């Protein structure tokens, strides 16, 4: 799984 925010 992966997650990113900006």
């Amino acid at each position: 799984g992966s997650t990113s925010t900006a």
Side-chain angles (χ1 to χ4, degrees):
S2 71
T3 305
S4 188
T5 66

